[PDB]
Amino acid sequence: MKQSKVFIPTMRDVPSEAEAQSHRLLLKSGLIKQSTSGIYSYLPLATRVLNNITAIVRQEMERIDSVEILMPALQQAELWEESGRWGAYGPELMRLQDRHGRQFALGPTHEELVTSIVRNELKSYKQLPMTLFQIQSKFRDEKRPRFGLLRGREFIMKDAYSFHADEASLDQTYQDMYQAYSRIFERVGINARPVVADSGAIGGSHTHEFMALSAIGEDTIVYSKESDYTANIEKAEVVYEPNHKHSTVQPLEKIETPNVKTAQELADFLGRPVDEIAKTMIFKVDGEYIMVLVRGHHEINDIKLKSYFGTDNIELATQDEIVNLVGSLGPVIDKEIKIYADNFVQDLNNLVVGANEDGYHLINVNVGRDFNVDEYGDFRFILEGEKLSDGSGVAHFAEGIEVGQVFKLGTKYSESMNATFLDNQGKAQPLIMGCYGIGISRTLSAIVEQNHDDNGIVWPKSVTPFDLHLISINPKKDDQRELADALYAEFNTKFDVLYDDRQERAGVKFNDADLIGLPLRIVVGKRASEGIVEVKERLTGDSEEVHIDDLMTVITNKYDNLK
Amino acid sequence: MKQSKVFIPTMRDVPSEAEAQSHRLLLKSGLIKQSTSGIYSYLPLATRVLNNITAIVRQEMERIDSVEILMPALQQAELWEESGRWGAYGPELMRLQDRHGRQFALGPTHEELVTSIVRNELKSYKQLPMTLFQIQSKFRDEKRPRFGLLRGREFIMKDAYSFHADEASLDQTYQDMYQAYSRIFERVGINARPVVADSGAIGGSHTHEFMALSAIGEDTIVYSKESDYTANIEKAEVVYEPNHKHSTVQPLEKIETPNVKTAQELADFLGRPVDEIAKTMIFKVDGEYIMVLVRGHHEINDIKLKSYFGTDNIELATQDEIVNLVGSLGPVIDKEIKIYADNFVQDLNNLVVGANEDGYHLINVNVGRDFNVDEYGDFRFILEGEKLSDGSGVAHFAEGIEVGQVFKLGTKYSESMNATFLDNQGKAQPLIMGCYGIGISRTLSAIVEQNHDDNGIVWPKSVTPFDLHLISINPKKDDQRELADALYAEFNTKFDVLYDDRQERAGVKFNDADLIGLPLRIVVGKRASEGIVEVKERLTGDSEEVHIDDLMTVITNKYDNLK
Ligand SMILES: Nc1ncnc2c1ncn2[C@@H]1O[C@H](COP(=O)(O)OP(=O)(O)NP(=O)(O)O)[C@@H](O)[C@H]1O
Ligand SMILES: Nc1ncnc2c1ncn2[C@@H]1O[C@H](COP(=O)(O)OP(=O)(O)NP(=O)(O)O)[C@@H](O)[C@H]1O
Ligand SMILES: O=C(C[C@H]1NCCC[C@@H]1O)Cn1cnc2cc(Br)c(Cl)cc2c1=O
Ligand SMILES: O=C(C[C@H]1NCCC[C@@H]1O)Cn1cnc2cc(Br)c(Cl)cc2c1=O
Ligand SMILES: [Mg+2]
Ligand SMILES: [Mg+2]
């Protein structure tokens, strides 16, 4: 393609609101444009990268017999009522009415739709297993869209769904997908790690998330150096082995603590280490108010609380709800309320806690005497340095972007939506399901996060929108224009060449080229009359003069040796 | 792919409601499944056909420098307010609210979105022309979804938009698109004709529709045998040259006409030919009621009326609106109402018309004496046999499916949405726009309409979901299964082979194969031990025995000679 005919609105200045490097670079390089919060257009270069990603995805899906389909975005509410998700979900599910008042969801994911396709069609065990996938734009009215394509409201997902006669068959396809996902991410230029993910509040099914390792990552991976242990910090269990720090029991005492809000401020005020303070938070669990206690150097993990209580309906009590129930909160109160404490609170006595009265705290508070703990448990995040759940060694942290997930779904949808098959013994059984997804537009951004420098994007060979950037320094000069025209015709059969044929200053062409980030650059300039050009590598910045008779061999060898 | 792993829910019986052959066959062959009215899932084989169509589309777009992008479905109402389409359109535009009460349209087409992309980015004449396109699902809440993929509510469109400094540049790209569209349709196996289309009520810009010639087609193409004249029957002008059939003027007379509703019933009742009766219809044009007169053998053309009056707000008066104004209607009434008559009414005198009184009609009604005609004009459809507007010869009719359109849009959106560029002389000018579209999912159905027989689909080589159907008659037999396994491995590198490896009766495999419609079939049966198979052509039904040492050459030669 001649660059004069390709829309590439490169920017001089990136706005302050853009925080993530991938977001900043996709804007600056003229690859995406925001329509509104969380909603983007993919401009020509991004679209080519998306096409390269989806071609790799299609190869890897076909390799494991995952068969492509395309399902609708517009989905009748009645389908979502069958599963119960219509009623279970709130504003994140986008909803609308047609001209006859009939209600619809815009698909955030397709468990019901795909179940509706296969039910009473996958009728026998002889037809199983079956795996279907699509590459299709999903809709989620995210509370906080952010970081460009990393969290949109309209976004591209590759979602797959598999159907099975038994658990062993599901296990096989889950492994196939796991392996296919590893291949997909490596091929597109992402360094990713599969990590054990949380199975949800109620379920205990096997699930792994694929995490693109990057500093912008909002997930923390807990990993071992001694074993293959890798878990989301939300899931990673903390094993408690007693190590008491108890002193002589003292009488309870309310103390004045003016302008003291936080646990660390209280620690500083009393001249004590923060770990000896116990923090108290009020949660609302299935309508009932509870208290959760953790030490001052720890933080409450809501995902563990949800899994512990076995419900997703857990949230912090609001300002008004706290006042109606009881400044800094504490466990000593004359009221029927269940108090839960993290296991590591047992290492202390003479607790420092809130007084349920602004400007005050309690010291020398003791369990049994002053208040009772109903149950102890693992209600916190692991810290870096602590011993892992498998006993292999010490916990280390790495930050990650969730680029995909694999999930053993089971019979949830097939039971609720009556999707059955006749087994070996002729009896009706619900289809056993797996579901799997890659965030395609998120993955595009993750590629940029891991493949860029201070001057722009550095696209991997596998996904670069064009292979070669052919640039004329001054096309007013006949020798330069004509040589570049000839080289375009020569190289645009074997390679995809972006030919910067524009009547633009050399400096802007090179700045644009740095942003755009194609792996190899052929510069036609002052030595065109001699049949000499310059070849420049985007990754290293290495430049060399090359004569046109050698150029095909030099470019091909350089291209083949790219990662 | 092994057919045991591909979801293909072939049907024994097609429901009565499915009318169009393409709709019936896409259902019967297991290629689509309805989710609800006008909303479909594309099953594995249809998805492969769609991928083949879009690959051809992409090649032909790149050939004319039409550059791929991907724009969002979710579009803020504020954008649609800029153009005025938010207010101009009614229930066909699907609308919704997000969680903050902000209003959105689901894109039925993307003129505003694309204008928002390029405005203040295509800043100079030096950047023009620019052509962008996407392949993306559109949403239209159609009043009457029908014929499967021919009229959906969620459907795939390839929409392109071009931007220009002057009218000559627009003319060039319009011609490029016209030519590209001709190529696309021929390549995918559609016999199509470009025809002059109506430019709308207000505008007079150049537009052509591409019509897939087929009997299910709801459009009628008027064409010449002597010239290149081709027009939609909505547009095709009728030139009136007087041929009076006048008799001696008679006195007006009201006559009893019991149980006479229609013009032909009245003709039969009075013993007169139907052409001597004048029909009267009441229309509402920009709030004002009018009368339109046409002869009994003619019909009113609303598209001509809209173009004549220069407004889209024309509709028939309702039952209640007719009563408030005045059985069979007629022009003789004591009221201030404008009466328009088709030109061919002038060939008659002593008109037979309604009496504005149930059970009665008027005879011997004459213009000037009994009523006045305000204006005469071309308000009807041309009939087959009549002389064409260009004077080349006689009108012939062919039925067609509108598979695409090309349109010289001009500055409508660039004016309303302030999308300007600096011209040669440094002054701001609105971007001159073209817009173009192909219905991709409609085109898939049109391919089936033109490429099928009584036993199933007959896919063209260019778009067939697989190239070869490899079928084992009885895979319990080791020689058959093993030979078929070997041939699959041999042929699935050069070709895409669907291998019917299923443990199913031969009869169902062949019935499924006929429906599925791949061009060549390799049958492994009783002579597998001898290294002999049967090759069968789907189009002709010709079968021949072939030895496996000759099979690659025989298949390749047959495949190369397919249309
Ligand atoms: N709002 C979004 N924008 C872009 N990509 C997304 C978004 N939500 C999910 N994805 C991607 O789609 C994949 C599958 O969806 P899903 O498993 O439902 O995500 P999720 O659990 O909601 N992730 P998150 O919201 O980031 O915690 C994810 O692994 C992401 O890569
Ligand atoms: N409801 C639909 N279902 C499937 N395809 C459609 C639909 N509407 C339009 N298309 C296709 O998209 C192309 C461009 O859209 P457009 O020019 O807006 O169609 P249109 O004038 O509304 N046609 P029609 O509604 O059939 O009279 C058409 O030429 C069709 O091939
Ligand atoms: O979407 C999932 C589970 C899996 N679905 C198939 C693709 C891969 C993915 O991990 C989790 N999820 C995430 N977000 C959601 C948001 C809404 Br709104 C709804 Cl209704 C449902 C969901 C929802 O089910
Ligand atoms: O969509 C068009 C004009 C052209 N747009 C770009 C692709 C090719 C197509 O011919 C005509 N059209 C047809 N149907 C529509 C339905 C609705 Br609802 C709206 Cl808002 C707008 C429209 C509308 O503009
Ligand atoms: Mg989410
Ligand atoms: Mg329409």
CATH no. for residue A483?
3.40.50.800
Residues 265-304, chain B: which have Cβ within 8 Å of A? Answer: none
Task: Give the residues surrounding ligand 3 with Cβ less than 6 Å away.
Answer: A 85, 89, 92-93, 108-109, 140, 159, 405, 407, 435-437
Name the closest ligand to CA A217: 1
Nearest CB to A43: which of B33, B50, B69? B69
Same domain assignment for residues B389 and B364: no
The reply to whether B541 touches chain A by the CB within 8 Å rule is no
Reduced to 3 states (helix: H, G, I; strand: E, B; else coil), residue B244 is coil
Helices (H) and strands (E) in chain A, counts: 14, 31
Same domain assignment for residues B173 and B24: yes
Measured by CA distance, the residue closest to atom 5 of ligand 3 is A109
Q: DSSP readout, A273-337?
A: -GGGBEEEEEEEETTEEEEEEEETT--B-HHHHHHHHT-S-EEEPPHHHHHHH-----S--SS--
Q: For the CA atoms of chain B, what is the radius of gyration?
A: 29
Asked whether the beta carbons of A518 and A29 are under 8 A apart, the reply is no
Same domain assignment for residues B447 and B548: no
Distance CA B560, CA B495 (A): 12
Domain boundary among B438, B457, B476: B457
- C-beta B140 within 6 A of ligand 4: yes
Asked whether the beta carbons of B86 and A463 are under 8 A apart, the reply is no
Distance of CA A66 to the CA centre of its chain: 23
Give the determination technique: X-ray
Residues 415-454, chain B: which have Cβ within 8 Å of A? Answer: none
Q: Which residues of B touch A154 (CB under 8 A)?
A: 72-74
Domain boundary among B344, B360, B381: B381
Distance of CA B460 to the CA centre of its chain: 21
Same domain assignment for residues A96 and A200: yes
Nearest CB to B35: which of A33, A113, A137? A113
Q: What are phi and psi of B529, to 5 degrees?
A: -55, -35
Q: Show the CA angle centred on residue A318, arms to residues A314 and A322, nearest 5°.
A: 105
Asked whether the beta carbons of A533 and A545 are under 8 A apart, the reply is yes
Q: For the CA atoms of chain A, what is the radius of gyration?
A: 29
Same domain assignment for residues A358 and A405: no
Tokens of A100: 């006859």
Same domain assignment for residues B51 and B169: yes
Same domain assignment for residues B226 and B284: no
Q: Show the CA angle centred on residue B173, arms to residues B172 and B178, nearest 5°.
A: 100
- C-beta A119 within 6 A of ligand 1: no
Same domain assignment for residues A244 and A346: yes
Q: Is A524 exposed, middle or buried (0-12, 13-18, 19+ CB in 10 A)?
A: buried
Residues 353-372, chain B: which have Cβ within 8 Å of A? Answer: none
Nearest CB to A74: which of B1, B74, B153? B153
Task: State the residue range of the domain holding A184.
Answer: 11-239+382-457
Q: Which residues of A touch B440 (CB under 8 A)?
A: none
A155 alpha carbon to ligand 3 midpoint, in Å?
A: 13
Tokens of A332: 């000593």
Domain boundary among A417, A438, A457: A457
Tokens 């005198």: give the residue: B349
B440 alpha carbon to ligand 2 midpoint, in Å?
A: 10
Same domain assignment for residues B168 and B210: yes
Residues 74-113, chain B: which have Cβ within 8 Å of A? Answer: 74-76, 79, 91-92, 94-96, 98-99, 106, 113
Reduced to 3 states (helix: H, G, I; strand: E, B; else coil), residue B489 is helix
Tokens 């951004």: give the residue: A445
Same domain assignment for residues A105 and A246: no
After which residues does chain B have a break in its backbone, defined as C to next N over 2.5 Å?
Answer: 326
CATH number of the domain that residue A262 is part of: 3.90.960.10
Torsion-angle region of B350 (φ positive above 0: left; ψ -120 to 50: alpha; else: beta): left
**What resolution does the deposited structure have, in angstroms?**
1.8
Ligand 4 atom nearest residue B435's Cα: 6
Same domain assignment for residues A421 and A332: no
Q: Cis omega before residue A129 (within 30°)?
A: yes
The reply to whether A227 touches chain B by the CB within 8 Å rule is no
Q: Mapped to the 3 state alphabet, what secondary structure does A90-143 carry?
A: CCCCCEEECCCCCEEEECCCCHHHHHHHHCCCCCEHHHCCEEEEEEEEEECCCC
CATH number of the domain that residue A114 is part of: 3.30.930.10
Same domain assignment for residues A150 and A16: yes
Per the structure, the count of domains in chain A is 3
Tokens 């001054």: give the residue: A474
* Interchain contact, B92 vs A74, CB within 8 Å: no
Of residues B196, B78, B123, B146, the one with CA closest to residue B414: B123
Tokens of B536: 């069968």
Distance CA A29, CA A36 (A): 19
Q: Which residues of B touch A122 (CB under 8 A)?
A: 7
* Interchain contact, B96 vs A99, CB within 8 Å: no
Count of CB atoms situated within 10 Å of the CB of B120: 11
B92 alpha carbon to ligand 6 midpoint, in Å?
A: 9
Residues 6+ apart with CB under 8 A from A36: B76
Nearest CB to B72: which of A6, A39, A43? A39
B108 alpha carbon to ligand 4 midpoint, in Å?
A: 6
Residues 149-168, chain A: which have Cβ within 8 Å of B? Answer: 153-154
A437 alpha carbon to ligand 3 midpoint, in Å?
A: 9
Q: What are phi and psi of A249, to 5 degrees?
A: -65, 130
**Most informative mutation of B190, B220, B442 for ligand 2 (most atoms within 8 A of CB):** B442
Q: Is A171 exposed, middle or buried (0-12, 13-18, 19+ CB in 10 A)?
A: middle
Residues 6+ apart with CB under 8 A from B336: none
The reply to whether A48 touches chain B by the CB within 8 Å rule is yes
Chain A residue with the nearest C-alpha to that of B31: A69
